[PDB]
Amino acid sequence: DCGLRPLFEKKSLEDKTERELLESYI
Amino acid sequence: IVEGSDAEIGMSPWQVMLFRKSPQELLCGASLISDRWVLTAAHCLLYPPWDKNFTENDLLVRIGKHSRTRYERNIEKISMLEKIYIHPRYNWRENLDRDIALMKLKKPVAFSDYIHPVCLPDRETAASLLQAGYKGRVTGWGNLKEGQPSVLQVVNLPIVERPVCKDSTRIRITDNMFCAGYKPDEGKRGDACEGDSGGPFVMKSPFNNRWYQMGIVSWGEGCDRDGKFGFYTHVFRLKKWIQKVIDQF
Numbered sequence: 001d002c003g004l005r006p007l008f009e010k011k012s013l014e015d016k017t018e019r020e021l022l023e024s025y026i
Numbered sequence: 027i028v029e030g031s032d033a034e035i036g037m038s039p040w041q042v043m044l045f046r047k048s049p050q051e052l053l054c055g056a057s058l059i060s061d062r063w064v065l066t067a068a069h070c071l072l073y074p075p076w077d078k079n080f081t082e083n084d085l086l087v088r089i090g091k092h093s094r095t096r097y098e099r100n101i102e103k104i105s106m107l108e109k110i111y112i113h114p115r116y117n118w119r120e121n122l123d124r125d126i127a128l129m130k131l132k133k134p135v136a137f138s139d140y141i142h143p144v145c146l147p148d149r150e151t152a153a154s155l156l157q158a159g160y161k162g163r164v165t166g167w168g169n170l171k172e173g174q175p176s177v178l179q180v181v182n183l184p185i186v187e188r189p190v191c192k193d194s195t196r197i198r199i200t201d202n203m204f205c206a207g208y209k210p211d212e213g214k215r216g217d218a219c220e221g222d223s224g225g226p227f228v229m230k231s232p233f234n235n236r237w238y239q240m241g242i243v244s245w246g247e248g249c250d251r252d253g254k255f256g257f258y259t260h261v262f263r264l265k266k267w268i269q270k271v272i273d274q275f
């Protein structure tokens with residue numbers, strides 16, 4: 001049980017800036 | 027954290043706060059890697075130049091804490107330390123090479139919506155995510171300027187090329203560190219700052235949707251200065267030692 005957040009990943013919900021992270025991977 | 031934003035609740039559930047017991051004082055950041063293990067920066071615990079050399083007994087840790095002023099009663103947890111472990115080759119005399127320490131909790135903490143561990147990088151996750159330009163995320167209750175926040179602060183910063191890191195400072199850098207942040211050309215700013223050491227530099231894996239801690243806020247010169255970059259302990263480079271103290275006798 002690591003790297004997955006109950007109020008986010010477990011809920012299939014993105015926090016507000018993580019897409020900034022995934023986009024940087026391009 | 028300089029030029030960061032307020033963290034949404036539950037956004038960084040592995041966030042840990044290292045406090046001085048007597049008297050109460052927030053010392054550094056840290057991160058939860060298991061129910062009994064907390065990872066942090068060696069210098070947060072041992073640094074003679076600053077008359078710093080703590081013992082388990084001198085400190086405590088707070089987890090699931092969303093406010094420095096209020097006490098989310100059934101949310102946050104306070105755990106005492108049972109043992110501190112500082113990397114054997116931590117070089118505080120020169121460049122803070124191997125600025126990493128492990129703290130074993132007296133008793134296990136219970137995971138919740140507000141508390142959960144961050145994953146440690148495996149060989150291939152690290153080979154794929156550790157690329158300049160790729161952004162990671164740094165969190166911390168540290169200084170807002172070279173200024174203390176009421177909410178955990180977070181900043182997304184790109185990993186920078188080793189040569190660029192090396193040329194940006196006179197301090198001798200090692201393979202055990204990496205730097206991140208924007209270039210003056212880039213437009214955006216942001217940086218960790220004094221107080222934030224020990225806190226995590228994390229990245230989300232596109233492969234499995236999980237967050238991994240790639241760095242530990244280690245050092246810098248000033249905060250958010252153009253041409254400068256914050257330095258972090260390379261977690262994967264030190265994975266062998268982490269496992270060693272963790273899996274022992």
Ligand SMILES: *C[C@@](*)(O)[C@H](CCCNC(N)=[NH2+])NC(=O)[C@@H]1CCCN1C(=O)[C@H](N)Cc1ccccc1
Nearest residue numbers: 121122218219220221222223244245246248249256
């Ligand atoms: C303990 C941490 O809170 C802190 C993090 C500073 C981050 N800076 C930025 N802008 N990202 N670390 C320190 O303050 C360390 C500990 C010892 C002194 N130090 C420094 O960062 C000095 N400013 C530079 C330095 C001195 C000696 C060895 C390495 C770096």
Ligand code: NA
Nearest residue numbers: 250251252254
């Ligand atoms: Na800078």
